[PDB]
Amino acid sequence: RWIARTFFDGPEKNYERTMAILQIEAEKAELRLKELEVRRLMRARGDGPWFHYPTIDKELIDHSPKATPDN
Amino acid sequence: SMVYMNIMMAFTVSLVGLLMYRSHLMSSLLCLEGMMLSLFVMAALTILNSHFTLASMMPIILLVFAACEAALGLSLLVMVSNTYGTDYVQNLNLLQ
Amino acid sequence: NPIIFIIILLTIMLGTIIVMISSHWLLVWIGFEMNMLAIIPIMMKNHNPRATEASTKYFLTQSTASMLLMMAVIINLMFSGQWTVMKLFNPMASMLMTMALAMKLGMAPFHFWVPEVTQGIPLSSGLILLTWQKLAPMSVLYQIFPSINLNLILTLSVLSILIGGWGGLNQTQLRKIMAYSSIAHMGWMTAVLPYNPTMTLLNLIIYIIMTSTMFTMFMANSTTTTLSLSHTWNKTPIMTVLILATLLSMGGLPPLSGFMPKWMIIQEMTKNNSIILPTFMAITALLNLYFYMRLTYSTTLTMFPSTNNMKMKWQFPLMKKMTFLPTMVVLSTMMLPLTPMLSV
Amino acid sequence: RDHWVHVLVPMGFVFGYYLDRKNDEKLTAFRNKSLLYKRELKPNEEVTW
Amino acid sequence: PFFDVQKRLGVDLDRWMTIQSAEQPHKIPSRCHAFEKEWIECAHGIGSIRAEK
Amino acid sequence: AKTVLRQYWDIPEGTECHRKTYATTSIGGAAGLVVSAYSVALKTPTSFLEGVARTGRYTFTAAAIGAIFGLTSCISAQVREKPDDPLNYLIGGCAGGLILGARTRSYGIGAAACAYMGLTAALVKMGQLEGWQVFAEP
Amino acid sequence: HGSPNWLKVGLTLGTSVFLWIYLIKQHNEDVLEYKRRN
Amino acid sequence: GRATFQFLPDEARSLPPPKLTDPRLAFVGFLGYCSGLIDNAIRRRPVLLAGLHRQLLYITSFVFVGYYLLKRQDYMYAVRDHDMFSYIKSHPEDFPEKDKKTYGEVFEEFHPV
Amino acid sequence: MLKYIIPTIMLMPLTWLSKNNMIWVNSTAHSLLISFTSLLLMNQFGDNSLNFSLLFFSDSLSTPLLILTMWLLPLMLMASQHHLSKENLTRKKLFITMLISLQLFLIMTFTAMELILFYILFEATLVPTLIIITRWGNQTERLNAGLYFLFYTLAGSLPLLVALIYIQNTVGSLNFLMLQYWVQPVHNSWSNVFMWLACMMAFMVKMPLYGLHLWLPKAHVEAPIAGSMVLAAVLLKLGGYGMLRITLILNPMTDFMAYPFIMLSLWGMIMTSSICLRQTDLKSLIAYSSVSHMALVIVAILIQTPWSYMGATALMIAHGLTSSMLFCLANSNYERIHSRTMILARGLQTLLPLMATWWLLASLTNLALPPTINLIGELFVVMSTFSWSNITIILMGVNMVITALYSLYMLIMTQRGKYTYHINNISPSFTRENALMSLHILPLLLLTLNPKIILGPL
Q1: Of G9, G33, G38, the CB nearest to H53
Q2: What is its quaternary makeup (chain B)?
């Protein structure tokens, strides 16, 4: 009688602790299927800035009337 | 045109069997300086007809290092003959 | 002599910055041209006739490995004329690119650049300076990365640890044993480079740390494995415990932090449904550990300290930045949830 | 002296038991369950959290 | 790795001798100047992996 | 090249036992020319002739494995029960390896050439049987 | 007697108090810079 | 991913910041606490409670640097999820809504021993 | 574990912090005090289940197994002091600290909450064991045996990482054993053979089959000061239990290829105990007993369906206490005659009468005399694999026959006389020699009263 309430708990703590650290997992193990949905398979679009490769900058082009009438 | 095949055939003056072998190592350092003008010319034919107007300073700068490079390599080839008197690439002591 | 030794030494790292700070293939040509110009004096300093017959075996290997690179530039000068550092627009250029640059980092072909130099240079002191030349071309393969043939970069890397492994079981000279397993740790990082080219740099920053701290331990007297016996009971017995810890860390054992790369690098190699590729290499670096065990069986078991010579005096070398190396090269495996989000 | 080498070191138990309690006071997600496990109306399933 | 110092602080170390249509000191263009300016107009904000196809 | 495999893996599949071992001795015949040969040849400089023969001599010794390596399969592919199987193609491992066992005498090489070759034999056709891909991309 | 160099002994004791006060002022500012931004 | 070549950019203001008494920051420098003890042990000190001024400033080093290092680690995951959820938000054709089906639909194997 | 690891790390800056020869009494004093605290919060209830705190503990709920891991540091320090006390105090402080450093990782092991936390702690050992093998042995064949202890354990355990990382990104995440409610089955394929096989074979290398046992009479034969890590290496072998955590789920339906693991480990059982009756090294006599009736669990795990898990759990800590003490019987009686040759130690049983009971009550637990923890273990395994096929009573019965003639052959070699020699061997089995030989049978026959504490889920 004086062992349980003097030391530990019953089915109101270690039950619904397994409800608490199994709702830290269902938002962990569902996102790891969505990284691998998007990261590994972006793919042919390159839309989001992960697979974004640089090409060239069109700011440095010139528009002056360069002296050749047929360039 | 054919002015590029000759000379891209003439880039094979490396050919690696005769880039360090055989002895009289001066014969091998020869084609290291003679591998230039197969790069100095092959650049100069391309910058010049296609009027880039700016990249033709690069063939001038292409000599300036490779001269200073090979001059450094020629300093050490005296040091192999300063200790011996003969270069002779079949000198080997430090194994691998 | 003293001031000009810095100006030579300063421009070595100034040569490699221009390799990284560049948008133009001409400047990356100059970048590790002058490194091949400013290493040759450091080879020399005490003028011994092996060293002169070693730097000249070093020299022309990095003259041709220079020279094919400028050949690879002028090919895709003809094709579309852009000179930004990016994909090379020609499979005859990129093939000539990657296996030209494989000589400066030396892979498994282009073989004896690594042992024949590092052995027998009387400057064993350092020659830690052979970590810059592993660092300059890796900064070039970060950009060229989405233009390769995917077979050549693996075939130089699958051969890398299979032949960097076998090569050194037949050794005593501990400079060669450091020269070997330096191709092997270039095998793990370029096997990964086509798949997510960061989490390559994680392996490199670890490799600078664990190798730099190995040479600083070696600078008491150590030349050969038999000389690695005669300092436990003579110099300091705490040195024997330290030289155990880094080797067992650099083998990749999970209580230490050389297991930090692999553990993460297989998270990327599978996730790409490639399973037979890591299982070959992961079982290959196992006889990369039989260097280190059978090296630790020398110093840590009191194997014959004979020829009674007393070092009754203290030690005054400069063990610079040594107190903080085996505290981030061993104990970091818990403390890196994201090192790959700082470096990314 | 007063021997901190001795029994002061098993006093790390309650020091460790202090850190033992700090997790369950942020693991307080569900008072909503159905298997006694109630937290229905009462001050019984609220306490000891 | 590509540090890109010269994008932070606005000096051009090089950047000018790169492409076929940049400056032209007295404004004499190349033989294909009309297609350089047209092609660079295509892939600017495009991330170059969809630009190939 | 890869198209040799695109005429190896495509058409026969157990039957047509001559063109199977005609193409499967090309690949293994080509690797006798390989770097091993290259290395030894260079290493010994050989001579003006005879030396050359001797060097290649062993390359010719090497040739012969891929000659039987379809032949042990394509006989035993159809005669038993007519699929191609991992236990079918296992048979070409041991006696296919025993060419290296027959020359350069056995009792320490030949059974070890038999055993390990039988391990790496069946896994190849097992590879496409599960759809294995070594050098892949996402 | 005691004989240190008496030059740097205190620079280590003076750098931390420079570092910590620079840290805590950077921390006590940035503890408010969250709410100042969010 | 924009605003290139910063140690940590301007937009990291709305992140918590990672305040102290976190066990990593206790651990960062705990190894430095171990490192300063090594710093005596290399040199035949022979103290192991040597000069405290060498045994201090290791603690000050790692903790300051490690704090100033961790402000971008929590940024980089925060910028990671920020770009994923946007690409989740656009393109619903790549993200379908699965049907909710209880255990009255499945007929599984059934393999008993 | 809330804080069991946190006091047992605080043991470590107590040893070097101490004075002179007080370092033996200071360590053994506090190390016994954990045995109350180890029992204290654990052994709770109990019906599905005790998830303990967080991502660091599932409390080792249905398999206790961990109280025995905490006896030993206050069991080995009293055992190791026989021939250790000639070295320096600077190394005597070392050998206590790495021994505690072996107990640290075993405490987060067996509980571990995950499968990838398991492996990095499954491999976090083998570094502090190898230091006790290479340094602190006797004459040579330490160094090859230091390498045979590696390269079996490490060659097998690396294809775990290929498969465990493969699961972590295939089906959700493995991080919890209680997110293992959604489990797809594993059918018959040509890739699902290897997924089963690579995940299993790294456990076979520690608890041996008849093949690949070649490292087990190497490390135990040439062995430290007085069984000092040999007591640890018998727990570590049965600390490869994690096949009970894996194979119950996580490919549950592959019994199709269990048969080359059954017949190899069921016929090997009847032979590898038979191959020991002609041993001449005494510590190698026990080293093959540890092969045989450890390998009975390998045909008790792969055969599923409890009334076997009743017994397969009770056999892990059956000879956890028995084979520990037999090594302690041989770590003693070597301090007096300096050979481990079993021929030489004759003329006994008159000279040391008080330890005659310690021989018998050891060897009466292999005969196993049904009210012990032993024949409550075997007779559940016997009544389990009877229901697999009836023919298995034959081989397992002859297993019971030969080990009866095997255990007595070690007893009866001391019942002879006239001693012929031996002006030494005077020491009449001092107070320490009986104390560390006790606390083995004192819990071993005690738990036979209510052995409901020793049971699985089940």
Answers
A1: G9
A2: Core subunit of respiratory chain NADH dehydrogenase (Complex I) which is composed of 45 different subunits.
Contact indicator for E44, A58 with CB cutoff of 8 Å: yes
SS3 state at G28 = helix
Spatial distance between the Cα atoms of I323 and I330, rounded to a whole number of angstroms: 11
Report the distance separating Cα D38 and Cα D49, nearest Å. Answer: 14
Q: Which two tokens stand for residue C340?
A: 């790959």
Q: Which residues of A touch C146 (CB under 8 A)?
A: 53
Q: D27 vs I54: CB contact, 8 Å cut-off?
A: yes
Experimental approach was cryo-EM
Chain G residues whose beta carbon lies within 8 Å of the beta carbon of residue H21:
none
Q: Which residues, 6 or more positions from G14, have their beta carbon under 8 angstroms from its beta carbon?
A: none
Task: Return the amino acid letter for C322.
Answer: M
Could you write out the DSSP letters of every residue in B52-83?
A: -SSTTHHHHHHHHHHHHHHHHHHHHHHHHHHH
DSSP state of C162: H
- Half-sphere exposure at residue I260, Cβ-oriented, CA atoms within 13 angstroms: 7
Which residue bears the tokens 């063109």? F19
Handedness of CA C58, C60, C66, C72 (dihedral sign): negative
Domain ranges of chain B: 2-84
The number of helices, as runs of H, and strands, as runs of E, in chain I is 24, 0
In angstroms, rounded to a whole number, what is the distance separating the alpha carbons of residues C206 and I247?
37
Query: By the CB < 8 Å criterion, does E35 face chain A?
Result: no
Which amino acid belongs to residue C78?
M
- The helix (run of H) or strand (run of E) holding residue I38 is helix I34-41
Cβ of C281: how many Cβ atoms within 10 Å?
A: 21
How does DSSP classify residue I61? -
I159 and C276 Cβ atoms separated by less than 8 Å: no
Structure letter (DSSP) for residue H12:
G
Contact F95, F68 (CB under 8 A): yes
Residue I350 backbone dihedrals phi, psi, to 5 degrees: -95, -35
Q: State the CB neighbour count (10 A cutoff) for residue I1.
A: 22
Instruction: Count CB atoms within 10 A of the CB of residue I106.
Output: 20
Cα of F134 to nearest chain A Cα, Å:
17
Question: In a 10 Å sphere around its CB, with 0-12 CB exposed, 13-18 middle and 19+ buried, how is residue F48 labelled?
Answer: exposed
Q: Per-domain residue ranges for chain D?
A: 1-49
* Cβ(C119)–Cβ(C51) below 8 Å: no
Dist. CA I363–CA I326, nearest whole Å: 8
Q: Which candidate, I358, I327, I360, I349, places its Cα nearest to that of I425?
A: I349
Largest Cα–Cα distance in chain H? Answer: 75
Q: Which CATH number fits domain B2-84: 3.40.50.1110, 1.10.3720.10, 1.10.287.3510, 2.170.190.11?
A: 1.10.287.3510
DSSP string, A10-67: -TTTSSSSTTTTTSSSTTTTTTHHHHHHHTSS--SS--STTS------GGG---S--S
Query: What residues are paired with C224 via a beta bridge?
Result: C173
| Token duo for residue I40 | 């204290």
Contacts of B24 (CB under 8 A, 6+ apart): B87, B88, B89
CB atoms within 10 A of CB B51: 16
* Residue burial E34-44, b: 16+ Cβ < 10 Å; e: rest: eebbeebeebe
Q: Please, are residues H4 and E4 in contact by the beta-carbon 8 Å criterion?
A: yes
Chains D and C touch (3+ CB pairs under 8 A): no
Residue A53 is nearest to which of C82, C146, C272, comparing CB atoms? Answer: C146
Rounded Cα distance between I177 and H45, Å, is 50
Resolution of the experimental model, in Å, one decimal: 7.8
